Amino acid sequence: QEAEQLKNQIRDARKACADATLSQITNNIDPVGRIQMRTRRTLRGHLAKIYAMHWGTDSRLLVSASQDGKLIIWDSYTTNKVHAIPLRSSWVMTCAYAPSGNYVACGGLDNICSIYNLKTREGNVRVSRELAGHTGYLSCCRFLDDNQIVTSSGDTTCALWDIETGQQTTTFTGHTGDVMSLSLAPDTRLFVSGACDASAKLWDVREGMCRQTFTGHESDINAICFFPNGNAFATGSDDATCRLFDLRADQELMTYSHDNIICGITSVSFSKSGRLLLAGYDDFNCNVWDALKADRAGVLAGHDNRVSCLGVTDDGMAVATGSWDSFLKIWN
Amino acid sequence: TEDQRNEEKAQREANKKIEKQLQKDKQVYRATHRLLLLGAGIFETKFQVDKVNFHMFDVGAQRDERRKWIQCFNDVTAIIFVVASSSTNRLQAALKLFDSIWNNKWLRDTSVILFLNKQDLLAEKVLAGKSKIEDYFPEFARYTTPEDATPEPGEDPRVTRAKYFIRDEFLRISTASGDGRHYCYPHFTCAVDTENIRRVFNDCRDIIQRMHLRQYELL
């Protein structure tokens, strides 16, 4: 294969820049203390297990998906269902709220991303378009704007679409195994992608080719999320650890791993400033990791089943952690 | 406050209508039975036996590695497992897949029904020697009929030694690690969708009845 001279070159490229790491610098940084967060609300009313949720840009309306075939759009302030959409396929696996607020996308095991139109002049909600072309199960779709949606399927492929025509504009291929999650950058020109091969591939939207491939994990990667600066991203896996990678350095920086956690992270998201790193585990908890000293400084233990999704508002005022008990709490 | 009250009331007027629809949908979601039909290595089929709604969700448009999308099927009442007992060596792949479903972290509360298909083609498989049952399972050559359980009439003592050997081969997997509410229901079938839905309904009743007896701690 003649890739050995290319196998060693990046390995010494990571070693030549691995000087004075993040653990050595933040020895002088003061800690944050134990952070008491209590369940402010409890948005009960789902039937089956909540599998995904996404916050609005207005930080008031959150959409949630579950296996019963419903797509509720709650109001987080008043605990009121603004819409309840009857889905076609029951086994949905992700949901996304458009940054304009007009549309909501939800597609799962039926290999089809369905764009719903909540801004319909007629009150009844309806499917705007019905994307198709993927073969595997759909894992995570997110909205760029009201015209472009990039999704992640289980056939080792990410695809960038245009909604008005229903065509794959750009198909991102190069992964091995099922792609599990997705997270857009704040400039929305790049996005990282974690798959079931212990590698989180960073993609370019307007190109279709992997910019850099980061591999420091050792099991299936279940969730990913950018840093607010856009120069880094955390990554949760089934390894029961989180790893804060870096774009400009192309190596891992921290390793958020305690000794007692024998349970894979299913969801991970930063705070508004990125000082905290809220991660949703499989032991029914949400361990808040201080993302600069890698010491756990908080536990959100309200649920009695495993947390599926974990969203943080755009202004940093609340945290919603859905779970498999059909209950979606709103922490603070 | 009063200008904020009518918009709150209109939000309340939509919430009460949405809560009205969910109570009409909860009593039909909790009344239907979800299934799952996967083989040894159409997406939704709905039938009904004795006024009970069955939702046999059939996968098969997905890929082969199934460690991620089978976690969605933990709330399913029963996972229908159909094997190809005629085989190359599809039987060992069906056995190791059953070991991974039974000992899964999230599927250890979901029972599994078995449908040992390819039945009559196994009768000629033990005589031809293309894929012999002794070639992949040589312990069958010393294994005899386990008990005096009556087989189907019009059969040979060799072929009923074969298919009952496939039965407790799977019962060795299930009875070894019992922690949860899973129960293995083996059956001997030849073709699907002919009298087998009675065998699914009679066994899906026993999962619901054992679910309520577990709630009262009677079992």
Partner: nanobody, 128 residues
Framework: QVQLQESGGGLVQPGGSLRLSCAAS????????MNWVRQAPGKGLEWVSD????????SYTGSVKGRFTISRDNAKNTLYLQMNSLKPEDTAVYYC?????????????????????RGQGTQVTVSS
Amino acid sequence: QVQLQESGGGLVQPGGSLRLSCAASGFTFSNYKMNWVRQAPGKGLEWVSDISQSGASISYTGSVKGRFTISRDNAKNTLYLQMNSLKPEDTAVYYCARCPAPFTRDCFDVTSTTYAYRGQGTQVTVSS
């Protein structure tokens, strides 16, 4: 980087013996099951054997039971399958295959697709 370097293999006369060494580097080796998956030429992938973390439930497929012994060393991060009394039907490429996740008792690694935690594969052959 999860990589499974495999050694051994080659041409061995039938009825003889051979030893394979799965050199695993890139993970905590004492936390996962480890399997051996073989691929006969022109046939699909077939599961051969498996071993636990320290080794307590060792199983084999029935065609090679009593002839192959799988052993692991959690201090050297190396997995050994000892071949003895070879048959011509054992002519296959043998893949070391870790299980998907840690501290678990359920693996899904017989897949024909590019499984991510499976080695490159070494080839064993029989002679006349």
